[PDB]
Design a protein around this ligand. Structure first.
Ligand SMILES: O=c1ccn([C@@H]2O[C@H](COP(=O)(O)OP(=O)(O)O)[C@@H](O)[C@H]2O)c(=O)[nH]1
Length: 434
């Protein structure tokens, strides 16, 4: 009888959505036991009696002094991860007296495919982001072949139209590690390999819906053995008190997810735009970053806006008082804004965020871009006006309503995501081959 090993990626918003799916799987397959592996800090943060969490090593050696490189924690985790997860799984097998029958893992868990092969079990990677970024990873060699790896200077606005479903994607929209950025880094090489091995998975599953882009869906089904859209998850499953008192569609919510803050000059520009427009606001800003706020900003905005280290974001976005979302365009944030019917103001930083920005602005038309890709005072005030007071916002809100309805049908009875989820339950329910 099944024992599903679940290997979480413990940085950014990766472990939470994975746990979210595992909970649905555990309810759907009550006879299967689920062992959820992440770091202790990740597990404490994110946490069905058939699920048990196991803390695995963060990969940091006992006396280690950090160099202070960016994503040094991520490198240390990744290098040790194969062995960290192995030791966790040994523990879980011993506790349950059940061999692992299925390996579910974040697609960023490098070597999960090899671990599953060695154990003789199915590999079911979860892509936590959008099919746009899934597509470009799976086509990394073709993209590199076509564009080259010596840079894109003078070609930033050229179109990725040779890749199915990517006609609106520009060269500059690509993730770091594809054709620009540090192509030789550990993160780049691992991502490169991931893209190459994903076609060998039993099934790749994703928090999205097929009808988001039928051509992209068809293309990915052609590149992968089995490809299963099972979302949007969020349509399946004092901030609020303050919002209660605000006019409909009048509040700007600002957040950059779990690991990103804009640079100090952009923190300033945002504070100036909020002040000059006097737009009511809730700004999720790391407390440490408050040092970058201009003297007097908090005092002058106290009567109409709040700066908090953490907001109940999905609930805020669902609140009738919210009229716009200034976002880094992370995948989970985008779908929560769609659930709430709130137009985006896009300021992507890295990873898949530019692709998501492009999707929002140019494909779905549910948000606006910031001219220059950086916060300026006047640029932000224009976005606030366009969305909150002008016809553009009315159109974006209409686009959001139609998009949400499609998404809702995908997760309804007989929906594409509902049917795909049945397929995935069937896969994780399968005992280990004899
Ligand atoms: O103040 C905050 C900031 C973010 N989030 C949650 O953090 C997640 C951000 O996910 P995303 O994919 O957008 O960005 P990431 O954190 O991975 O960069 C979302 O579920 C947000 O609702 C939140 O609850 N409160």
């Amino acid at each position: 009888n099944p024992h599903v090993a679940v290997l979480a990626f413990p940085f950014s918003t990766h472990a939470a959505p994975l746990l979210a799916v595992v909970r649905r799987l555990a309810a759907a397959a009550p006879h299967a036991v689920f062992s959820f592996f992440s770091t202790s800090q990740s597990n404490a943060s994110i946490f069905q009696c058939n699920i048990k969490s196991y803390d695995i090593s963060d990969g940091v050696p006992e006396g280690y002094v950090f160099a202070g490189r960016p994503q040094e924690d991520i490198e240390l985790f990744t290098r040790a991860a194969p062995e960290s997860f192995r030791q966790g799984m040994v523990m879980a097998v011993a506790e349950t007296g059940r061999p692992v029958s299925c390996l579910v893992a974040d697609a960023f868990i490098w070597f999960a495919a090899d671990m599953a092969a060695e154990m003789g079990v199915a590999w079911l990677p979860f892509w936590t982001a959008g099919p746009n970024s899934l597509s470009t990873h799976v086509y990394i060699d073709e993209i590199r072949e076509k564009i080259g790896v010596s840079g894109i200077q003078g070609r930033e606005d050229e179109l990725l139209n040779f890749i199915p479903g990517m006609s609106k994607v520009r060269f500059r929209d690509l993730q770091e590690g594809i054709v620009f950025g540090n192509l030789n880094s550990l993160f780049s090489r691992m991502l490169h390999r991931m893209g190459q091995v994903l076609p060998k998975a039993t099934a790749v599953f994703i928090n999205s819906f097929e009808e988001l882009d039928d051509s992209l869906t068809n293309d990915l089904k052609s590149k992968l053995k089995t490809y299963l859209n099972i979302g949007p998850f969020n349509l399946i499953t004092g901030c609020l008190q303050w919002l209660k008192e605000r006019k409909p569609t009048s509040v700007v919510y600002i957040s950059f997810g779990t690991v990103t803050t804009p640079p100090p000059a952009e923190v300033v520009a945002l504070s100036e735009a909020l002040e000059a427009s006097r737009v009511p606001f809730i700004w999720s800003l790391r407390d440490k970053a408050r040092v970058h706020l201009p003297e007097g900003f908090l005092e002058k905005t106290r009567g109409y806006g709040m700066v908090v280290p953490w907001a109940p974001q999905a609930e805020v976005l669902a609140h009738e008082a919210v009229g716009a979302f200034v976002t880094h365009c992370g995948w989970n944030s985008l779908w929560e804004s769609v659930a709430g019917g709130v137009p985006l103001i896009c300021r992507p930083f890295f990873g898949d965020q530019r692709l998501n920005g492009r999707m929002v602005e140019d494909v779905l038309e549910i948000g606006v871009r910031i001219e220059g890709g950086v916060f300026t005072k006047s640029g932000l005030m224009s976005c606030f006006d366009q969305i909150l007071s002008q016809e553009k916002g009315k159109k974006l809100r209409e686009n959001l309503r139609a998009l949400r309805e499609t998404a809702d049908r995908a997760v309804g009875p007989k929906g594409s995501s509902t049917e795909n989820f049945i397929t995935l339950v069937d896969l994780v329910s399968k005992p280990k081959d004899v």
